[PDB]
Amino acid sequence: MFYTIENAVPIHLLRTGDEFSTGIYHFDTKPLKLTHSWQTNRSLGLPP
Amino acid sequence: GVGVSTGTFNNQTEFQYLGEGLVRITAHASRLIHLNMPEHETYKRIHVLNSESGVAGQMVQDDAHTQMVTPWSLIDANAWGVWFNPADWQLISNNMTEINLVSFEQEIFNVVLKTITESATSPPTKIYNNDLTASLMVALDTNNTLPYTPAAPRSETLGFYPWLPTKPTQYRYYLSCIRNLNPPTYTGQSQQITDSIQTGLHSDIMFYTIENAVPIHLLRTGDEFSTGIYHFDTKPLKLTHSWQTNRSLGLPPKLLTEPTTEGDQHPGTLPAANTRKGYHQTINNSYTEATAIRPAQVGYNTPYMNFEYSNGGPFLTPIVPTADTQYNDDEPNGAIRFTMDYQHGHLTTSSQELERYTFNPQSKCGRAPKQQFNQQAPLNLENTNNGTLLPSDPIGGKSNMHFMNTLNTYGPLTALNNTAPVFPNGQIWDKELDTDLKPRLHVTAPFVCKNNPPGQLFVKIAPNLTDDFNADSPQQPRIITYSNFWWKGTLTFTAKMRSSNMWNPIQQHTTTAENIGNYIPTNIGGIRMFPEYSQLIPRKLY
């Protein structure tokens, strides 16, 4: 697999007075939990 | 509303048949519940360390952990025995190909609270009054804030009998442990086993309170209460068993010699190996059945009797329960041994308490490790004691631990089957483990709620304070009180009828003059509810 920036993507030239901006990408991602579980098999269900 | 009944008793089993062959199995279950006044009005955080836990070998016997003992009692009816009776089961399993959870609703009624006054006038006489005004506390954790604790796996469900009263159990959940058992031992050896436990990592402490997380309804004799009407979102359950194994998948090799004499004795002949044609997931120009291309892996060996150890301690690594092979193995095939109770089957009368009985699902998948084996590099029909691992080879130097004990064959190619419904002690639905990645099924029960599971029903007798104040003191004294209140639940399923496709008749559970005894009372009033196979209808797999 031999890729080339030049060969696969259009390149913008920028002089001091120039600017550039990504569009606005939207993610499609499974939300991330900010909580931790603790229970282990020895802690699941109805205690004897 | 003192002298008026709030609800109604009904323990009928309605089987509505609809178009295209579906059925609205509606199970009504009523039962007279009895509740005693909680003996310790507080929330206790107890540990548990058994002498047995800290001994050479007896590690498997470890019972350590921490309990949050609440003053509340729980009403769990999640267990087949609650809803159906022997006949019901026979019908459903003998004729439905699949069945699924639909709606469920409980209802508590005809509450009655009772005071008990002591009269030690010579012989200890008991006087029973009615505290018309006292109340019965009821709480419904709709959102499941309180830790889920199915009763079924500890036969602490409601009584599988409509004509017999029953008791709800003490609600107590698990709390973080920091169990220590280093290091494992073996029956004989002398070593110093450290056996400790200290309430888990602070960051993992979960201390719930019925009072703090759920609104509680007070109920006086004339009061009533009812769950809404919960709807399940569950993967339908198959009531049929597969049989085909990898040695029974696809196009059987064509024979060249059909027998000429009656009897399963005389078989047919297959052309020699070599001359056979087709795919091979091996090199040798000879195509054998054991070594033949199959769609996938039906079943899989799960390292058996393996004990894993995480914070809370050591524990057995669960195995998907599937039917045993002709070499009744069980333990490696996750068989499930239930223990009955004077209220969940098992002759009410019998002198000995509880019953045994192990269970084996019908779907054939399981294995017979005492048979399995491995060969090296280019296979080679005709082993090399050196290039062949056997079911009797010493692993890691121990003369009885063979490779199978450590062998795990799970893979993308694995095709597996779900647990089976176990009438009656079996659990029915189950909450899903809130982990980022979920399990493909549970062993506990066959139904796992995709959404939020039905709510836990809590009960506790309202403290009947005396005149000897409260507060400004440890444990408060109160009038001895108790309650008799009825309960009615309505569990609704959906199932499909079966149909004659093949030529031969199939399995079906029936009455033999040698078992009716089990479905008939005793000359004294004994009743049994011995468990029965389920999923007894044959099914193609490929």
* Cα B410 → chain centroid: 23
Please choose, from the candidates B211, B161, B193, B164, the residue with its C-alpha nearest in 3D space to the C-alpha of residue B41.
B211
Between A and B, how many CB-CB pairs are < 8 A? 61
Instruction: Find the CB nearest A38 among B63, B148, B200.
Output: B200
Dihedrals φ, ψ of B126, to 5°?
A: -105, 135
Contact A7, B117 (CB under 8 A): no
Structure tokens at B258: 């059909």
Burial of B473 per CB tally in 10 Å (0-12, 13-18, 19+): exposed
- Cα(B398)–Cα(B406) distance, rounded to whole angstroms? 13
Q: How many CA atoms lie within 13 A of B529 on its CB side?
A: 29
Q: Which amino acid is at A22?
A: T
Dihedrals φ, ψ of B87, to 5°?
A: -55, -45
- Cα(B349)–Cα(B342) distance, rounded to whole angstroms? 8
Interface with B, mutate which of A30, A32, A37, A42 (most B CBs under 10 A): A42
- Residue B213's H or E segment, with its range, is helix B210-213
Looking at the DSSP bridge assignments, the partners of residue B137 are B218, B460
Looking at the DSSP bridge assignments, the partners of residue B210 are none
Say if the Cβ atoms of B154 and A33 lie within 8 Å: no
Q: A29: which chain B residues are within 8 Å (Cβ-Cβ)? A: none
Asked whether the bond before B184 is cis by omega within 30 degrees of 0, the reply is no
Strands B113-119 and B414-415: unpaired
Interface with A, mutate which of B174, B197, B205, B444 (most A CBs under 10 A): B174
Measured between alpha carbons, how far is residue B525 from residues B137, B159, B512 in Å?
34, 16, 22
CATH architecture of the domain formed by B1-542 = Beta Complex (2.170)
User: Is residue B143 annotated as involved in ligand binding?
Assistant: yes
Q: How many CA atoms lie within 13 A of B198 on its CB side?
A: 5
Gap from A34 CA to chain B (nearest CA, Å): 11
* Cα B280 → chain centroid: 41
Q: How many residues does chain A have?
A: 48
- Cα(B76)–Cα(B431) distance, rounded to whole angstroms? 13
Burial of B227 per CB tally in 10 Å (0-12, 13-18, 19+): middle
Measured between alpha carbons, how far is residue B460 from residues B66, B164, B400, B473, B485 in Å?
22, 21, 52, 22, 12
% helix / strand / coil in chain A, to the nearest 5?
15, 0, 85
The residue with tokens 């280093």 is: B182
Q: A38: which chain B residues are within 8 Å (Cβ-Cβ)? A: 176, 200-201, 204, 206, 311
Experimental approach = X-ray
Looking at the DSSP bridge assignments, the partners of residue B207 are none
- Cα(B431)–Cα(B149) distance, rounded to whole angstroms? 9
Structure tokens at B320: 């998907």
- DSSP label of B235: -
Quick count: other Cβ atoms within 10 Å of Cβ A41?
15
- Cα(B107)–Cα(B225) distance, rounded to whole angstroms? 6
Contact B116, B480 (CB under 8 A): yes
Contact B213, B145 (CB under 8 A): yes
CB under 8 Å to B125, separation ≥6 — which residues? B119
